[PDB]
Every structure is written in structure tokens, then in C-alpha cells.
Coordinates of C-alpha atoms and ligand atoms in Angstrom, one line a residue:
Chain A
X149 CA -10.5 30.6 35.5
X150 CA -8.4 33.3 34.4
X151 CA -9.5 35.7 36.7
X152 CA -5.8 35.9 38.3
X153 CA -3.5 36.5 35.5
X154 CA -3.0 39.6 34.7
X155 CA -4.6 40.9 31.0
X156 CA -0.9 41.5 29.6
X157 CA 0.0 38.1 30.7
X158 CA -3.1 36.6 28.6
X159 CA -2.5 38.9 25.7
X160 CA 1.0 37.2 25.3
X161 CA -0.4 33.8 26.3
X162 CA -2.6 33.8 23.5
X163 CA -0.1 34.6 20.8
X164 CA 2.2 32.0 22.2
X165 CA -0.9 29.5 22.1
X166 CA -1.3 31.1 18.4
X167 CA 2.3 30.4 17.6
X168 CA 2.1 26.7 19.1
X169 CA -1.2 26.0 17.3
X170 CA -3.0 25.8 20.6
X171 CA -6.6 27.6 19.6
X172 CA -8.5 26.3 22.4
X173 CA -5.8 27.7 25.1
X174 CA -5.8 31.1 22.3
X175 CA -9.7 31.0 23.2
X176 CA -9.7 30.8 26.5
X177 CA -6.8 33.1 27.3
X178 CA -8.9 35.7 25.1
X179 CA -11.9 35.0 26.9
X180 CA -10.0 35.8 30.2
X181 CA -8.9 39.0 28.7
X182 CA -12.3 40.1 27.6
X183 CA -13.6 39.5 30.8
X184 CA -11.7 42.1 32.4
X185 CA -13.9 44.6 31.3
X186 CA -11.7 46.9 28.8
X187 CA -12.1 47.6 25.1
X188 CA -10.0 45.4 22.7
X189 CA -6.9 46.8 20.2
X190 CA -7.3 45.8 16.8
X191 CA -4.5 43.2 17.3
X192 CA -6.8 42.3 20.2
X193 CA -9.4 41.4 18.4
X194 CA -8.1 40.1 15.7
X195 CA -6.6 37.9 18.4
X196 CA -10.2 36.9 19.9
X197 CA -11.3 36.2 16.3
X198 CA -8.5 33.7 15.0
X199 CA -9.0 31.8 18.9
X200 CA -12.4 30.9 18.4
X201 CA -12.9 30.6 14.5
X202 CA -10.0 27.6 14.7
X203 CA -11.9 26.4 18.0
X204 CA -15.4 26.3 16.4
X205 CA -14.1 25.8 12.2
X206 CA -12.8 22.5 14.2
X207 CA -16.3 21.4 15.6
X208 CA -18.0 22.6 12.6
X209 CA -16.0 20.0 10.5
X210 CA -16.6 17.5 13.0
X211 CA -20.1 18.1 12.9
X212 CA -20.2 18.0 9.0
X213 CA -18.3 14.6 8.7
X214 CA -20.9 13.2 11.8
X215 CA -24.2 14.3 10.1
X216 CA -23.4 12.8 6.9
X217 CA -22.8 9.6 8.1
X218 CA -25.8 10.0 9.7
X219 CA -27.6 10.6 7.1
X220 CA -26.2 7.6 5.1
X221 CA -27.4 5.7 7.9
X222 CA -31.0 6.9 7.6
X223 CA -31.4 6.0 3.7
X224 CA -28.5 -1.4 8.0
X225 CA -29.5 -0.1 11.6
X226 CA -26.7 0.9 13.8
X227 CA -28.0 1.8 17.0
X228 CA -28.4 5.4 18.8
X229 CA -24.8 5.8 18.5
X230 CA -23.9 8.0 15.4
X231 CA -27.0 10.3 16.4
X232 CA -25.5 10.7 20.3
X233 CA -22.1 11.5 18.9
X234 CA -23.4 14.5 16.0
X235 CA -25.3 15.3 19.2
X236 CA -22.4 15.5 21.6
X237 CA -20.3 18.2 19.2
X238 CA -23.2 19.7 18.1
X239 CA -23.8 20.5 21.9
X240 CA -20.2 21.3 22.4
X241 CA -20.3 23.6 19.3
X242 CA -23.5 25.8 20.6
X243 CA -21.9 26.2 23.7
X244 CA -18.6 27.6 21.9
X245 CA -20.7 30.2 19.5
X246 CA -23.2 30.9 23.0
X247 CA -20.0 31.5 24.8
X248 CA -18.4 34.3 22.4
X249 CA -22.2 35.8 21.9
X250 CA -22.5 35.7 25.2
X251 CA -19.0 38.0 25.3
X252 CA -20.2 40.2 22.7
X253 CA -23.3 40.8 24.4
X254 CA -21.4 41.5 27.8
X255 CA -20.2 43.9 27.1
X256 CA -18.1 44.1 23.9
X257 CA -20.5 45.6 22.0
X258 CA -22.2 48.3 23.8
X259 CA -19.2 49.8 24.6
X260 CA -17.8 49.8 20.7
X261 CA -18.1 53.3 19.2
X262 CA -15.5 53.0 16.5
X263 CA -17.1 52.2 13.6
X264 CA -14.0 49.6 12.7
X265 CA -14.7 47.7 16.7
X266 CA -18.6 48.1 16.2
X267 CA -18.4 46.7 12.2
X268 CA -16.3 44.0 13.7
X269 CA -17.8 42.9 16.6
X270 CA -21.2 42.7 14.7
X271 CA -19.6 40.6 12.0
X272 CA -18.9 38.0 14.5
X273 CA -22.2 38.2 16.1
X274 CA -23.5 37.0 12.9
X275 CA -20.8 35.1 12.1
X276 CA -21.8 33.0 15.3
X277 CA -25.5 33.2 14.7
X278 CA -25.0 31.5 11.5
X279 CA -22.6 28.7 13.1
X280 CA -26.1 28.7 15.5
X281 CA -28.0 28.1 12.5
X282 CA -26.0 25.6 10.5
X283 CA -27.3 23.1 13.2
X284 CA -30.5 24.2 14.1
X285 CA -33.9 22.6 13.3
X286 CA -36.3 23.6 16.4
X287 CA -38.3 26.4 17.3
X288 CA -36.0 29.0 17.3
X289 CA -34.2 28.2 13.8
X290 CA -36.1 31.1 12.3
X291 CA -35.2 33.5 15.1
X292 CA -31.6 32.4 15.2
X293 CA -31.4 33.3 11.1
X294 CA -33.0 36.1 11.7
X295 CA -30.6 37.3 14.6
X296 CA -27.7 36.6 12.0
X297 CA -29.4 38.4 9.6
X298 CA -29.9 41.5 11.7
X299 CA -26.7 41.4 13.4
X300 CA -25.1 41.6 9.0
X301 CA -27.4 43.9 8.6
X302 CA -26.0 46.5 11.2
X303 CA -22.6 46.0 10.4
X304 CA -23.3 46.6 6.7
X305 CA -25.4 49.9 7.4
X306 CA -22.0 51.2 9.4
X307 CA -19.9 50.1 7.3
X308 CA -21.3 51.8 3.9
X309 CA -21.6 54.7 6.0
X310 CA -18.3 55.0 7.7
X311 CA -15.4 53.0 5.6
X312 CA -14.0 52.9 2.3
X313 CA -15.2 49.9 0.3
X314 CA -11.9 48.7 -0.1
X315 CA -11.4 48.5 4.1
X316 CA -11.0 44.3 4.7
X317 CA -13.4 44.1 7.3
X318 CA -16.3 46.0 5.0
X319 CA -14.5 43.3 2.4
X320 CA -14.7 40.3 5.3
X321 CA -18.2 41.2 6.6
X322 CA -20.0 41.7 3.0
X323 CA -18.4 37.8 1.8
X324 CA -19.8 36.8 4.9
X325 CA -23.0 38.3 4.8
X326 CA -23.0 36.6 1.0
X327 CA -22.3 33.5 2.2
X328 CA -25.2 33.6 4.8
X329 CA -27.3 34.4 2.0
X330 CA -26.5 31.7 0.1
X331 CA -26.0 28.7 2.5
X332 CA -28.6 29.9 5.2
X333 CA -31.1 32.3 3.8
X334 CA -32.1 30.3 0.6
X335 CA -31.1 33.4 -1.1
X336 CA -28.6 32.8 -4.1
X337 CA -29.2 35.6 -6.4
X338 CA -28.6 38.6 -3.2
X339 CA -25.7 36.4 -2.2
X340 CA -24.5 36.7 -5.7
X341 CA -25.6 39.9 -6.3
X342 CA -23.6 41.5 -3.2
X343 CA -20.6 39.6 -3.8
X344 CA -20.6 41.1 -7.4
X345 CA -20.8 44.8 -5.8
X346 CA -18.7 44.5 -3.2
X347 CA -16.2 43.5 -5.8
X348 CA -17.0 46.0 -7.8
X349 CA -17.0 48.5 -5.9
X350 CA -13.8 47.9 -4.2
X351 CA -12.1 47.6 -7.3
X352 CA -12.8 50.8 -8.0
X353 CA -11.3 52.1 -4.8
X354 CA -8.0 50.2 -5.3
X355 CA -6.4 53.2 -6.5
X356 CA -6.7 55.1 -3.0
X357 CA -4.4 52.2 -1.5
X358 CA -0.8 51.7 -0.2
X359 CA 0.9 48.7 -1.9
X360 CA 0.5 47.0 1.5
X361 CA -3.4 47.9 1.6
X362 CA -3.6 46.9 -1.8
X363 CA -2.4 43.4 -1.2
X364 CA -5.0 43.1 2.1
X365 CA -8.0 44.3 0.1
X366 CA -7.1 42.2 -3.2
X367 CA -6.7 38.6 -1.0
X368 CA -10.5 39.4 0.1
X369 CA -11.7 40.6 -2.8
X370 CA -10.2 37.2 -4.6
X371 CA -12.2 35.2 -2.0
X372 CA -15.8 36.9 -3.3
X373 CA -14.1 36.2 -7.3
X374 CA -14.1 32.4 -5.7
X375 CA -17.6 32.2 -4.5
X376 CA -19.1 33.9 -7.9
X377 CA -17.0 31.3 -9.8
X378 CA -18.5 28.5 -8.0
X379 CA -22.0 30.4 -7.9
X380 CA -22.3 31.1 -11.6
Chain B
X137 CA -19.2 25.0 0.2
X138 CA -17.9 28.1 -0.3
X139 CA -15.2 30.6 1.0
X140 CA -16.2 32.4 4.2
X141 CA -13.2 35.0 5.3
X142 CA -10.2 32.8 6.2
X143 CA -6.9 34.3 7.5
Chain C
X87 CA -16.9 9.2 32.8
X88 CA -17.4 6.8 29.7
X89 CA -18.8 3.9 32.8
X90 CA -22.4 3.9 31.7
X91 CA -21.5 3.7 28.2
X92 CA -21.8 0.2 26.4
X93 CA -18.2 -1.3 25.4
X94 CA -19.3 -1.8 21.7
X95 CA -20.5 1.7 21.4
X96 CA -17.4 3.2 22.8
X97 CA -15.8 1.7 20.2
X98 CA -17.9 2.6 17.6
X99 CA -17.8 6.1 18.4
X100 CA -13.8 6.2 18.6
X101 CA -14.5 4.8 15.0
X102 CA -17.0 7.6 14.0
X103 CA -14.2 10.5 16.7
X104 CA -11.5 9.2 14.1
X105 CA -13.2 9.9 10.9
X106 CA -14.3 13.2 12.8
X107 CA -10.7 14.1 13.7
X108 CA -11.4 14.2 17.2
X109 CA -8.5 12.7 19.0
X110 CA -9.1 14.0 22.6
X111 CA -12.9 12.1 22.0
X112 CA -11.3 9.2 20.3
X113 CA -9.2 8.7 23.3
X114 CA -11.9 9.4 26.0
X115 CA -13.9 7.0 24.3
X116 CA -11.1 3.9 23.9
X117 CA -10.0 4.9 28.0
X118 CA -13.6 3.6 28.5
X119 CA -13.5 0.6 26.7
X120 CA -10.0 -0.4 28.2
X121 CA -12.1 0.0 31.4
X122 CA -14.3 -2.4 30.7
X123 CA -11.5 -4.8 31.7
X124 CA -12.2 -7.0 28.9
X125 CA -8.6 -7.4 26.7
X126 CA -8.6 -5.7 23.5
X127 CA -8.7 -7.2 19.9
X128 CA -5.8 -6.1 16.9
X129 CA -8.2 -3.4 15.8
X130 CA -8.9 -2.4 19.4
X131 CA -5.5 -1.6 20.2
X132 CA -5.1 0.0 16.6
X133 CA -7.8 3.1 17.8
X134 CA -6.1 2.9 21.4
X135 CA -2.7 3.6 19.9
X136 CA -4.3 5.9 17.1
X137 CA -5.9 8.2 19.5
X138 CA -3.5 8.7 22.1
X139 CA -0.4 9.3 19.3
X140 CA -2.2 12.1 18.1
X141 CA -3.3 13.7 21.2
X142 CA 0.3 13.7 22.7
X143 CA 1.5 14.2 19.1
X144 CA -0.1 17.4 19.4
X145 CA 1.1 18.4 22.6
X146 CA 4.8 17.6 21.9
X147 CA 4.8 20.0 18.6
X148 CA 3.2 22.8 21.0
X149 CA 5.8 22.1 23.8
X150 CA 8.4 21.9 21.0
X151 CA 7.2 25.3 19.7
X152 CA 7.2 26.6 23.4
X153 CA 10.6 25.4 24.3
X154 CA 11.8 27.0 21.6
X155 CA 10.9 30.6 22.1
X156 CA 11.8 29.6 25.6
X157 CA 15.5 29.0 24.4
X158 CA 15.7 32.2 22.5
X159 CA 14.4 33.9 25.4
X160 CA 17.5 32.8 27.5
X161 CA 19.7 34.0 24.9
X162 CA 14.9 41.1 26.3
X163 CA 13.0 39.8 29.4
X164 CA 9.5 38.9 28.9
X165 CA 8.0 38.3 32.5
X166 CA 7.4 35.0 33.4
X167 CA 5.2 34.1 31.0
X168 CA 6.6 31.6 28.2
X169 CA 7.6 29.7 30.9
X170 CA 4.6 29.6 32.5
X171 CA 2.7 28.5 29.3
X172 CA 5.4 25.6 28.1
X173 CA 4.9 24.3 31.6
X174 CA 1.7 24.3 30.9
X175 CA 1.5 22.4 27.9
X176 CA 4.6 19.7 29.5
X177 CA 1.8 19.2 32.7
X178 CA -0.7 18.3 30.1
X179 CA 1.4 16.2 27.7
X180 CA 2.9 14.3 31.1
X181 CA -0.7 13.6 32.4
X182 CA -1.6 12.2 28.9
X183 CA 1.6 10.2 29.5
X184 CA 0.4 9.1 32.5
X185 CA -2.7 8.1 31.7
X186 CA -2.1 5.6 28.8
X187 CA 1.2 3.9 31.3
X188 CA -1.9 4.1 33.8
X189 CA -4.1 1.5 31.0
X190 CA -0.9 -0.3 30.8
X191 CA -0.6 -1.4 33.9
X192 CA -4.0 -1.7 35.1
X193 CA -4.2 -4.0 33.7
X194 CA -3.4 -4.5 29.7
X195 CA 0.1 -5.9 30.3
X196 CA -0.1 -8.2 32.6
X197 CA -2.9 -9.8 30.6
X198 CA -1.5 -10.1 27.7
X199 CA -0.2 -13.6 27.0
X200 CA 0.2 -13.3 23.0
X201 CA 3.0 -12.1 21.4
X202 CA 1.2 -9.9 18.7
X203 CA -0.4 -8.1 22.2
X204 CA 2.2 -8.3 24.3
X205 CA 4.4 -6.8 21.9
X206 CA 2.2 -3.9 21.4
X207 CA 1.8 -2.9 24.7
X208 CA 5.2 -2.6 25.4
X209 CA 6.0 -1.0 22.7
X210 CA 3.3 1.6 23.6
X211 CA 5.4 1.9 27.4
X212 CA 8.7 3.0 25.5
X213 CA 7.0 5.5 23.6
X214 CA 5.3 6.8 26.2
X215 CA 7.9 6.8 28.5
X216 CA 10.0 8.3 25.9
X217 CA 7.8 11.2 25.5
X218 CA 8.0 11.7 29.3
X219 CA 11.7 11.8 28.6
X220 CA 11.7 14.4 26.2
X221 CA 10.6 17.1 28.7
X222 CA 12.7 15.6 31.5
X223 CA 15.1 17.5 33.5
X224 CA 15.0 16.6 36.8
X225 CA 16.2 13.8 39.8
X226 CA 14.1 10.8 38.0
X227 CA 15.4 11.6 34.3
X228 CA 17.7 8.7 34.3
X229 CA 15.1 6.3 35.5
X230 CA 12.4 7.6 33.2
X231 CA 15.1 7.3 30.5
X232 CA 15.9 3.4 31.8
X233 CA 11.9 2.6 31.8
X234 CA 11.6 3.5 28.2
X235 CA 14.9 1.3 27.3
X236 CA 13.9 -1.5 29.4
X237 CA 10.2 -2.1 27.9
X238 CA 11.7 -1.6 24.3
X239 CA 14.0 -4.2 25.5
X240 CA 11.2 -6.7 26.4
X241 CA 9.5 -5.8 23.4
X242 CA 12.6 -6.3 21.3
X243 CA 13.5 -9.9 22.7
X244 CA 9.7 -11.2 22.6
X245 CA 9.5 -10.2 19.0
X246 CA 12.9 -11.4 18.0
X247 CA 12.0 -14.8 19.4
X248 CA 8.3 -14.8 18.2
X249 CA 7.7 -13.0 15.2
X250 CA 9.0 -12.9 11.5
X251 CA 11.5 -10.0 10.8
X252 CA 8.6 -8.3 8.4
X253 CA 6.1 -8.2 11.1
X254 CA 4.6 -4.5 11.3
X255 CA 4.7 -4.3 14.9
X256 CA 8.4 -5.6 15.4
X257 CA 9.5 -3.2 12.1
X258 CA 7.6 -0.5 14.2
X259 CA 9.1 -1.3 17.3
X260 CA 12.7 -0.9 16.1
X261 CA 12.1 2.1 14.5
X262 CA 11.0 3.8 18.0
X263 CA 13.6 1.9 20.0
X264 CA 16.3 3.1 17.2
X265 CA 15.0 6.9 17.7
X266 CA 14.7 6.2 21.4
X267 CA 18.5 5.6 20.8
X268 CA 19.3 8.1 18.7
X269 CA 17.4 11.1 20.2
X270 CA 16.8 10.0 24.2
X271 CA 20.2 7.7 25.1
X272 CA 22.8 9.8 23.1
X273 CA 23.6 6.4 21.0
X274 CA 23.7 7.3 17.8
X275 CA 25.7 4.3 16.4
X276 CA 23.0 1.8 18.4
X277 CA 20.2 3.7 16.3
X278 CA 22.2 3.2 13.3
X279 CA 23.1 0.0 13.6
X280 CA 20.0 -1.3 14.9
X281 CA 17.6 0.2 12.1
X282 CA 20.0 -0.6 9.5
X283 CA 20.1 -4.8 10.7
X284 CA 16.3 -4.8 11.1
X285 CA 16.1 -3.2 7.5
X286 CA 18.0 -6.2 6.1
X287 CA 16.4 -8.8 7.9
X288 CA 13.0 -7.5 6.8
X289 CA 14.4 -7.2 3.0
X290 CA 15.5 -11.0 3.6
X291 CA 12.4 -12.2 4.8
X292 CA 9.6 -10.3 2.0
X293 CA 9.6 -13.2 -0.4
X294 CA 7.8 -14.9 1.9
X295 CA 5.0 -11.9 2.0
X296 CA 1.5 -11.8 -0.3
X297 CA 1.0 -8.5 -1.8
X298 CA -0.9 -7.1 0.8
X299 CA 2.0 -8.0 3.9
X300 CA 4.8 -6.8 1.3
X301 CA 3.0 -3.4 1.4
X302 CA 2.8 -3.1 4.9
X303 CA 6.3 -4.0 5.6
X304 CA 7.8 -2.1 3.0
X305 CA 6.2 1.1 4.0
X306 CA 7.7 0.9 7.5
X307 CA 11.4 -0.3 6.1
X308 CA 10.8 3.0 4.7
X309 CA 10.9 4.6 7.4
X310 CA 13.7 3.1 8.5
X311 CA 15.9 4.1 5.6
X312 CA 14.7 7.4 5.9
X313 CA 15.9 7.6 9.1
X314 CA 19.4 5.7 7.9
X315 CA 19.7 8.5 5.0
X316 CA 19.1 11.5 7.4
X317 CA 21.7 9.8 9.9
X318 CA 24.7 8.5 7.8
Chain D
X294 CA 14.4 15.1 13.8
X295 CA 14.1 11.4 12.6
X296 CA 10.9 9.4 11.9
X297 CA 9.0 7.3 14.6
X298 CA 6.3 4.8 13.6
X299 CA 3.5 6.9 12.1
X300 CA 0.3 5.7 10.0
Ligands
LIG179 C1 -13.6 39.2 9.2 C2 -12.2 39.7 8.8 C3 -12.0 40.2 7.5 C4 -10.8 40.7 7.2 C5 -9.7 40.7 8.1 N1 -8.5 41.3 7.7 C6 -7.8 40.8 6.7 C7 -6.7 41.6 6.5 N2 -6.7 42.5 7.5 C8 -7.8 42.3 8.2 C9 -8.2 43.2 9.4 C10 -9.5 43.6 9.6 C11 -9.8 44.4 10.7 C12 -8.8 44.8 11.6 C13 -7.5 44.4 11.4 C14 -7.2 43.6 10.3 C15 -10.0 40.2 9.4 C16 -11.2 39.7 9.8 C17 -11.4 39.1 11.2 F1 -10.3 39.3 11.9 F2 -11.8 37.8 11.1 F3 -12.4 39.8 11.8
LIG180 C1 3.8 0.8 16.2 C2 3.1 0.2 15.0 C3 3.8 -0.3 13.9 C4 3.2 -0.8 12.8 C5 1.8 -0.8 12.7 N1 1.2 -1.3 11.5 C6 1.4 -0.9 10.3 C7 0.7 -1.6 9.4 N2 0.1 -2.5 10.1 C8 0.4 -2.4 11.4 C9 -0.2 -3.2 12.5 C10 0.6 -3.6 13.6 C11 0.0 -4.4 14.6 C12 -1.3 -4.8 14.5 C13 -2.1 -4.4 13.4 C14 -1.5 -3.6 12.4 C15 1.0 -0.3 13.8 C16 1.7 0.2 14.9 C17 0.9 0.8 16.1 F1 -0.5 0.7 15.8 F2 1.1 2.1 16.3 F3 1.1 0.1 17.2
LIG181 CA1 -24.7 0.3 17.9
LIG182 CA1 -15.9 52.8 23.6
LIG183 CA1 5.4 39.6 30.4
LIG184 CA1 -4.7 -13.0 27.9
LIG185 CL1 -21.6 10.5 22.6
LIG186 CL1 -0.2 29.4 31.6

């Protein structure tokens, strides 16, 4: 649908839509400028990220706040109602994570080479894979943590190799990747355990940093302090 | 629930 | 779309869409259920009210936003753009707008004999046409502008003739007709003066009220003095 | 801006 505005045109569109708190417009304008087929800018990207984590962090609350009410109800009878509705966003929210997997797959990430658009593209693949997963029961719950899993598991092989540890989006994907190990995996102590090094280990880079650097890496690295507090 | 990465 | 759905269960899920946060559902979902052509109890035309206030609540922040940087811009060029996007957003709000004056009229109004409904659904036409009003410019300004005024003013003389001066839907309806005047008719003095005699008629009238009504009314004579202080 | 009727 956005086929005939120019990709300047939804660039600016979407930081209006940012400005005016508008995250599904922010989505879509970003999903028009994908879709014309050149690489994303870091602002870009960034851009494409904020869109769709507001549009889907939305649905994800809404689907929380459904499937413990119906759960309550399964412990007076209240018809098929509460079970359609959970089932309404929780179809809405696939289509939203399919729909940005479905841009990273075409063609976002084969044509990343940088290891900072490749790191971050593969963080969101996961990222969405694990949205795929909070919801999941059927066949393919196994294959969708394991495509989360995998997709982590990339980004954290590049990452290691090719950024400090103090860069935020080593810092963004390795709490991520903790938090998938710990809310999806079943796997506490290597959520804990990489939380603890990637702290670590980034401490010991602060020294490297620009004041400015320093305050982007230390915001990240209080948000793994927060987790191990409320893990240990 | 804890803290994914959040703006 | 909601005409296969059952009336009860449309209103049970605008229950379950409100504890969700989701506004856009919630009013989908009470749009059916005015449908059903049946007249709507108090509660009923609580979660009609509820939804659509937030949805165009929503839209009238962004358009605020928008019209903002739109003003600045008037003040380098920018292309075509923010424009583009506030009209955007006004085309939505006026189609929400639209809608609910649309359940109004076909046919809540015109059924509604009681003044505790009656009330209510006029009240709902001044806001609504208010909110059209705020993103008015052109030929039919003036006549949205008189639409609001005039079903205020129906509202105002049915609940001055039917209902106590603590009532929450007469308290509520002054306070919009007072901020119709104050930010839509340029009467500043009529807002004044009319939120400052409801306030003392309510305060006259609360010795009459149990605990429970005494906290209703008071927290919408509130309002009203809030307005009073920022106004005076 | 002034206060409307809100819940
Ligand atoms: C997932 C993630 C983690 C960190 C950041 N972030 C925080 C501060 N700066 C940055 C940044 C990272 C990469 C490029 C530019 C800025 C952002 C993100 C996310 F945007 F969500 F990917
Ligand atoms: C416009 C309005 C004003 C007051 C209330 N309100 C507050 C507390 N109780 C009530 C109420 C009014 C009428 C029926 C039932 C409850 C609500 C409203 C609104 F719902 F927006 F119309
Ligand atoms: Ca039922
Ligand atoms: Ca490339
Ligand atoms: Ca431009
Ligand atoms: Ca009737
Ligand atoms: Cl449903
Ligand atoms: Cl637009």
C-alpha cells in the first residue's frame, strides 16, 4: 500500500508517526520502506525496530491480560468467548512477528554484510521467534524455539567476533538472548550465567568509551544488573 | 517477567 | 463485520478488549452490539462511551502533535509531507466521528425516551461534534460548531428539568458544554460562568448523597474547579 | 488545555 510514496517520504512519515505516538502507521511506513529493496541506515533500523516492538509489545500485553483470565476461567462456565478473543490477538500477533520475519527473510538479511546490520537484523529474527513462541503449543513449538535459538546463536558468534563487548547491540542481543533462556528455553542458570558475563565483560571495556558511549553501554548493562537481581 | 532491551 | 456475532458476547468481549486495553476492538465490538438494534442498558452505553473516547482520544493527541510541527513548519521546507500525514490522521479521527454520530442517529436517539439515556446520547453528539470542530476549517465550520452547541443545549435543558444537580451525567455534561465554550465558541466567560453555577448547585445538593453518590459527584465537581482554577 | 469529562 505504500508502493507510491517515495522512500524519503516514508522515512519522515515514520518519525512523525514516532513523534505522534502512532506505532502502527511507524510500522507500516517502515514496512513500505523496506520493501523498496535498499539496505537500511542505522537510524533506519533503529526506526523499523521501535515501529514494530511498540506494535507487537502492545498485542503481547493484550495477550497476557486475555490468557490469564482464561486460565482463571478453566480452574463458573462462560462460554467460548474469552478463548475466541486470546485467539483473535494471538492471530493478529503471529501475523505481526510473520510479517517482520517475513521482511528479514526478504531480503534484509542476505544482503547485511556489516557485522553491526547482520548482529542486528539477527537479533530481531529471534527476538520475533521468541514473540512466535510465547504463544505457541502445537507441532511446531519446538521448531519455532529452536529457530529463535539459532537465529541468537548467529548473532552472538558475530558479535564476539566482530564488536567490542561494550557495543549496545552485543549489550541488547546478549540480554535478549538471556531472557530467551530463561522464559523460553527452561534454562535459568545459562540465562544467568550470560547475563553475569556479558556484564562483566563490558565492564571491563568501559574504559575504551566516550562519555556519550559510556552512558549508552551503562543503561544496557543496568538492564542485565535487573534481571540477575530478580534471578538470584 | 523480566527486562528484555527497552528504549 | 461483528453480524454473526451474539449480542451478549459482543459485550462480553468489549468487557474482556477493555481490560486488554484494546480500544479499536472494544469499539468494533460495542458498534456490533448497537447493531443489534436492541437499546442499550447504563453499563452498555458506559463501554460504548469508553471505547470510542479512547480511540478518538488517541487520534486527537496525534493530530495535536501533527498540527503542531505543521505550525512550526509554516514559520525550512520539508516537502509535502507533514501535511500529508496530519491529514491523515484528521481523515481517521473524522471517520471515527462519523461513525459513533452515525449509531446516534440510527437509531440510539430517537429511541431514547428516559432522561438518564437521552441525556447520554446527546451528550455523546456535542462531543463528538466538538471533536469534528477541532480540526475544522472549512465552509461547514460554523454549522459543525452550531451542531455541537445545539445537542449540548438539549442535553442541558433535559437534565436541568429531570435530574438532580449531582447527577454524574448532567455534572459531566456541563463540563464538556463549558469546554465546548471555552475552547470551540470563543466564550470564555459562558465556560466560566456555567462550570462555576453547576459547581455550586452540585455542592448544594450533596447532603442529599450516600457515600457512594458523594464520591461520584465530587470527583467530577473536581473537574470542574480544575478547570475554574486554570481559567480565573 | 482544560479538562473534559474523563474516567
Ligand atoms: C536491541 C537494541 C539494543 C541496543 C540498542 N541501542 C541502545 C543505545 N543505542 C543502541 C543502538 C544499537 C544499534 C544501532 C544504533 C543504536 C538498540 C537496539 C534495537 F534498536 F532495538 F535493535
Ligand atoms: C460523560 C460522563 C460523565 C460522568 C460519568 N460518570 C461518572 C461516574 N458515574 C458516571 C455515570 C454516568 C451515567 C451513567 C452511569 C455512570 C460518565 C460519563 C460518560 F460515561 F462518559 F458518559
Ligand atoms: Ca458467554
Ligand atoms: Ca550489503
Ligand atoms: Ca520531504
Ligand atoms: Ca425507548
Ligand atoms: Cl473474537
Ligand atoms: Cl500520509
Amino acid at each position: 500500500a505504500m508502493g507510491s510514496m517515495e522512500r524519503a517520504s516514508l522515512i519522515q512519515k515514520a518519525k512523525l508517526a514516532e513523534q505522534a505516538e502512532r506505532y502502527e502507521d511507524m510500522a507500516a511506513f517502515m514496512k513500505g520502506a523496506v520493501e523498496k529493496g535498499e539496505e537500511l541506515s542505522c537510524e533506519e533500523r533503529n526506526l523499523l525496530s521501535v515501529a514494530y516492538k511498540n506494535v507487537v509489545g502492545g498485542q503481547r500485553a493484550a495477550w497476557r491480560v486475555l490468557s490469564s483470565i482464561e486460565q482463571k476461567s478453566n480452574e463458573e462456565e462462560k462460554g467460548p468467548e474469552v478463548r475466541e478473543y486470546r485467539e483473535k490477538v494471538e492471530t493478529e500477533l503471529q501475523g505481526v512477528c510473520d510479517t517482520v520475519l517475513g521482511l528479514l527473510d526478504s531480503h534484509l538479511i542476505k544482503e547485511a554484510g556489516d557485522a553491526e546490520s547482520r548482529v542486528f537484523y539477527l537479533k530481531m529474527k529471534g527476538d520475533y521467534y521468541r514473540y512466535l513462541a510465547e504463544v505457541a503449543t502445537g507441532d511446531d513449538k519446538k521448531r519455532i524455539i529452536d529457530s529463535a535459538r539459532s537465529a541468537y546463536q548467529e548473532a552472538m558468534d558475530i558479535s564476539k567476533k566482530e564488536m567490542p563487548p561494550t557495543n549496545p547491540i552485543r549489550l541488547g542481543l546478549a540480554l535478549n538472548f538471556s531472557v530467551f533462556h530463561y522464559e523460553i528455553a527452561n534454562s535459568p542458570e545459562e540465562a544467568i550465567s550470560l547475563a553475569k558475563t556479558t556484564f562483566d565483560e563490558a565492564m571491563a571495556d568501559l574504559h575504551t568509551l566516550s562519555e556519550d558511549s559510556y552512558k549508552d553501554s551503562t543503561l544496557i548493562m543496568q538492564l542485565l544488573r535487573d534481571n540477575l537481581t530478580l534471578w538470584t | 517477567r523480566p527486562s528484555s532491551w527497552r528504549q
